[PDB]
């Protein structure tokens, strides 16, 4: 896949096609929803989940007290510094995971398509499938709706792929 | 025929960090750090006392201008930075501990006791504390002075037969000069001992002037003790005693003190920070480190963006 | 792969086949052992590894002491809360890794098979390989034992795949 | 021909958390949180004292019913919640620090010293401490009283010429009334100062009654000091002194005190928790936060399941 | 891929070939540089990034003080133990990521090659491509420099692959 | 034709840990734990005082051999383990707090004040402190004694009209015997009270000998107080007073004290550890836990190797 689609607004993942009827696009709502559910799940585990504290040590001081204060300040700074570490690590792991997650779902969509189009298509390096049966709309929707039957077209697609 | 697969893209995404790179463009990212407070403290669900000019200790002792705090309860007590006392000056050793104890109890519920202060004069007052335009004193303290030029030693045995702990607040007077101590107590020197079965406190009054505050060279020290059920509070004093009038209840609890100059508005919010209430959906905040309630954790990062989208373009 | 095999008990990963001799199954013990070794390794790094402490601060208190106790309690609560965080994160990372690990080993098994059956088989979306040589038992064991020679069957399998 | 690849499945798996979902079915998962203690404390590999009714301080001082603890050693000392003293009542300022020090030393090994308590009467006793049906006193303390109505100031210089630190435990008597102080010490007031080259302690006895405990209005305070090799312990006292009889050794160490009502059984286990011993294979536990030895970390999670299997069905 | 190349020194990832001109090898500098940039990035986020502290609690003690010291020591030990945990976890995650990273880049190189050699090559289990056009040097460099045109050779490669 | 893809390999790689295995061979790995210090402390960018034999307190008080530290500044003060005082012996209650305060201020900048020590004799000396071969005393203290067999009570009101806090260091003398106290102060007993508006300190001198140190049975205790702008320092004393000569400034700051026997060389390095300076590129170190400046974190791991390469062979 070379680039994204600025005009695709009905989902995150989808298909665009070119046939003899015309050009157009639609989202794959199962791929999109799966990506959405995992992301929302991760957000739900974090956002809205806080802990309740009521009484704590003093954090702000106005006078010199000596070693008791040095420790009370030390303890609080240690806690903050360490939670800041956890926060940065957590976000970086979550973001690394999120981008790998969405790319994984895209690869799954691609494989679903080549596995459904068994031997009726070639993988191009631009993220597109060359389809060797001259299909118009109905195959495209069938592929989108996981009902494409490779046994219908192989007899006509193979001779336009390997036999020329 | 050609069938292309791909992702949506947006005209303008946002930038997030990952573990391999610091700057990757993403469609949409949810900021996880609540920067921005409302600017006011919300008045619910928590019960909050405003503390107009009333340090939790002035409210405890009964300062002339804190008489509206008698028997109040709170989940959160708020002290204003402008608060000042307006009564006889005082010195609390280990101020911080008394302040914490009262704060966590969460109440100034007080009950009077039938103390037997006999052979002494009760209700001593000072021009330092004006209430109703007359000289008065802290409402929860009883300043004892001689009666007919006699200050007999006191000996009060006040048992705890209830099922709760009783907190007694009492103090020690430190007259400016020998002249004042003899005038007030008919003693050349005093001494105070307060005990329970578990512990004992004793204080020797320190006569001498300190720099004048509110034109007063003299001071009162505040001490406290806790009496467990089954114990007996024993007070023995030859002079300079600022007697208790009763006891405060102690509750275990969820209450505390915050210092804040924020106003209290009409709002519902669980997380309170000195800079007002903060919505608590985001997991982290960088508004302050002093918080109360179900708050986000404090971090030093100004921003953290969690991708919700995918790599753009 | 659509579902698992409730009857496979001699390993975690394996093969099931259908030929003219009959139907049956067996585990792939190299795939299974590799999965087992990584899992046991992860467990060994954690389970049985504790640190020894002897003297610590008081954690339980019966009396009101003041600010010294507030700090001693604060310090302990901070430690617990933070270790609870580490414990949850650790387990979630280990479990995310374990399920991705086992699926990875399964994908490796699948690729090993299609790479060994070079052009003699088609990937079906149900996780099965359609084999175009009419093999009976010996090929199946040969594939299981990494000795299948694609150069033996291509001459007969290709004409039953593309030439029909 | 058809060759299918796949995974095993089980009729009933278990549920584990991951980072993308909270509930994923897995074949088998190893619980990582040891909930459940044995219910008894194991007696090995660690050396454990039971502390039948003996607070580590009562054992230290030599309470009439703790005479079986003389010169004992432990890795772990256990205090029972039912323990009570049965001797003259006492008050240890900073009780917690003395308790920690003795606890970590791990021993009550004690050696007598040739103290020169001269011109005074040694071995003073009280009906408070009954041993062998006779009035006695704490076995490691020497209560000095006047001799022939005279209590000369004492001055004991006891040098440390050994290679180890010496811990001296001593106290101060607080008679109920003036009558008792004069009866016992032939002084109207006493004073105690104890010093080393590095530091000095001084105590003024506080005469007066406290609520009676075991019918006794009077109390003894306990103080301690550490003498380093090369130093000299100097004891100067005009009265109210509960003298040391010798010193305790201090060891650096791995010992401590746990509070527990659990019985001690016949078992081998490294991790000890107030609720008995806990097997220490799992990395986390949620039994308690108070532990001793090579224990799992305490977490607030009731469960943590680590998949050992794979996604089911 | 069975093993590595001890003699490849001009990059980390690369190609080795055998044709009628001879045998030889060269690095793929785009694959190598991408791997290098991600690794150096990770190192830059960690190495050279320290925090400045000036005044802290005492960590070394020479005398018995009582409970105040027990806490001051406890706090420091907690901090160290916990940062040691973070350090080990961090390195293990970074190393797990680094080895998966470099293998990922290798798989990307392999796919780039099979996607460029559309149907003109077979994947061997040893990590090599069997190329069915008898190419000499120029195809090899063309593949290395992402300019190989599969439409030039399919007419001659297919008949030496499937038609024999 | 054949085209093979693959990775480089090296004759000898290194071993790193991952999450699934402990020992995986890798081409190259960057050690992340700085073990090895330089062995000397670098003299820049930080300003470092060597402290040849000068404990920060001896430098503060003005010990005869620490006269080269007057008005010095530092980011880091280093104490040598060989330091010893060579002046009248002293005892600082809460030594650790005074030491921390002075250390963080980062300066011994001192200014003299026009104190009105009148009716007493100023500049008292002792053979304990020899400077220039003559008896002297600590340079920042003024030991007051009687004048014409009279020691009138003192009363010094020294206001703070400046914009900074003033730190006053003063002490209390504890003569060995009654003979010495009467000789020096013409009093049978003394007493010292020092106060501000915010707080009060009071000390009762303790007469009696301690083991002799440097042949001296007597000692001086050191106390300190902080005066805020707008306040007044009030000193009232009948005897045994070691008076201040002026005040030290307090700065908020980034300064501290490290104990180290390392020499200070000619080098530039940001991270300082007792075992000298440590290069600060690696994120972790295992040299020590005591550090100053932009240092690596201390870990207990001896090694951590972060792969920079890939799996070998
Ligand atoms: C798939 O799409 C085609 C064309 O719209 C339609 O005929 C077919 O019924 C669809 N299949 C299902 C079940 O979605
Ligand atoms: C960004 O994602 C959040 C979910 O966290 C969603 O509520 C919000 O509307 C999204 N914004 C855009 C640009 O769609
Ligand atoms: C605070 O977070 C909000 C999003 O909730 C963001 O719009 C704002 O720019 C942030 N402010 C800063 C400067 O951190
Ligand atoms: C607080 O003090 C200020 C100054 O006297 C006064 O104007 C204000 O009314 C006080 N607030 C209350 C109501 O106590
Ligand atoms: C206690 O109170 C009663 C009530 O007047 C009084 O008779 C008695 O003198 C008091 N007892 C004491 C403390 O003397
Ligand atoms: C002191 O005033 C209180 C009012 O709180 C009163 O109840 C008490 O009896 C008074 N005592 C005397 C001696 O008038
Ligand atoms: C006050 O003291 C005087 C002198 O001792 C005494 O006569 C009188 O009875 C006392 N009490 C009264 C009633 O004033
Ligand atoms: C110092 O304080 C005492 C307090 O009793 C006072 O008597 C004395 O006059 C004060 N000193 C002077 C001379 O001001
Ligand atoms: C000391 O001087 C101050 C200055 O006004 C004065 O108030 C005080 O009485 C004098 N004596 C004492 C008691 O310190
Ligand atoms: C919160 O209050 C603190 C202290 O008053 C201040 O430093 C900080 O800037 C405030 N933050 C916000 C978000 O207003
Ligand atoms: C593989 O299995 C076949 C059939 O059992 C057997 O003939 C062959 O020897 C096996 N190969 C090896 C070496 O495992
Ligand atoms: C679950 O896995 C553990 C290894 O941690 C193993 O010992 C146990 O027997 C397994 N249980 C089952 C159901 O096989
Ligand atoms: C405790 O862990 C065991 C497994 O070791 C488990 O069987 C038991 O149900 C757990 N108990 C609870 C309620 O946490
Ligand atoms: C502990 O005290 C109880 C109550 O007197 C007694 O029955 C028991 O024997 C004591 N245990 C020992 C042996 O000290
Ligand atoms: C010390 O002990 C000896 C032994 O009887 C005795 O002669 C001497 O009087 C004692 N010394 C003192 C402290 O007077
Ligand atoms: C006191 O009793 C002890 C027994 O521990 C004995 O050794 C000592 O000499 C006795 N002292 C006197 C004065 O009898
Ligand atoms: C006890 O005191 C008396 C009176 O001072 C004295 O005569 C006697 O010698 C003293 N000692 C004896 C032996 O009782
Ligand atoms: C208070 O305690 C002192 C202790 O010396 C005692 O003399 C006095 O009698 C006690 N007070 C009363 C009257 O009980
Ligand atoms: C005070 O009253 C109690 C009550 O019995 C009594 O024991 C004590 O002697 C009295 N005096 C003192 C000393 O507090
Ligand atoms: C362990 O002991 C504590 C305190 O006694 C108790 O709250 C907890 O329930 C006990 N836990 C178990 C597992 O028995
Ligand atoms: C690729 O390599 C071939 C052979 O060296 C060369 O002819 C061709 O121009 C190269 N293509 C590019 C643009 O790198
Ligand atoms: C190892 O990698 C580092 C980068 O961290 C590099 O500077 C060093 O030269 C490498 N060593 C080798 C063997 O190339
Ligand atoms: C310390 O780290 C260096 C690499 O910077 C390494 O060469 C040395 O062997 C390590 N020393 C030890 C024993 O940790
Ligand atoms: C430190 O003390 C030693 C021993 O007297 C002395 O030799 C050395 O010169 C002193 N260092 C300085 C210069 O103070
Ligand atoms: C203060 O100083 C002046 C200067 O000599 C002197 O006249 C006066 O006696 C002193 N004041 C006091 C403290 O008596
Ligand atoms: C004490 O010596 C100092 C030198 O620091 C001098 O300025 C001061 O005036 C002297 N005082 C007397 C009484 O000589
Ligand atoms: C010292 O004291 C004597 C005796 O009171 C007195 O006459 C003399 O004036 C005082 N001062 C001098 C000048 O020595
Ligand atoms: C104990 O110290 C006091 C200090 O005033 C001293 O008088 C007494 O002589 C000392 N005791 C002896 C007899 O050494
Ligand atoms: C006690 O004995 C020591 C031993 O030399 C002596 O220095 C001291 O004066 C005596 N008295 C005191 C004051 O403790
Ligand atoms: C650093 O100093 C400490 C204490 O002096 C010592 O234990 C440690 O071995 C030293 N480390 C190094 C790397 O020299």
Numbering used by the authors:
A (entry chain E), C (entry chain F), E (entry chain D): 10 to 173
B (entry chain B), D (entry chain C), F (entry chain A): 11 to 323
Paper text:
HA is a trimeric glycoprotein with each monomer composed of a globular head containing a vestigial esterase subdomain in its lower portion, and a stem domain17. Each subunit consists of a membrane-distal polypeptide (HA1) and a membrane-proximal polypeptide (HA2). The HA1 subunit is comprised of a globular domain (residues 116–261) formed by an eight-stranded antiparallel β-sheet motif that includes a distal shallow pocket corresponding to the receptor-binding site, surrounded by the five immunodominant epitopes (A-E).
By pooling the particles from the well-folded 3-D classes (100% of the HK/68 particles) we obtained 2.3 Å and 3.2 Å-resolution reconstructions of endo H treated HK/68 and Sing/16, respectively. Both structures were nearly identical to their natively glycosylated counterparts in the protein backbone. endo H treatment of HK/68 resulted in a similar uniform distribution of views compared to endo H treated Sing/16. Interestingly, by comparing the local map intensity around individual glycans between the GnTI- and stable endo H treated 3-D reconstructions we found that several glycans were incompletely digested by endo H, most prominently the glycan at N165, which retained ~10% and ~ 50% occupancy on HK/68 and Sing/16, respectively. In addition, 6 other glycans on Sing/16 also showed incomplete de-glycosylation, specifically, N8, N45, N63, N133, N246, and N285. The incomplete de-glycosylation observed after endo H digestion has two implications; first, that the increased glycan density in the HA head restricts endo H access; and second, that the partially unfolded 3-D classes likely represent a subset of particles where these glycans were successfully cleaved, or conversely, that the glycans with partial occupancy in the well-folded trimer classes are particularly important for H3 stability.
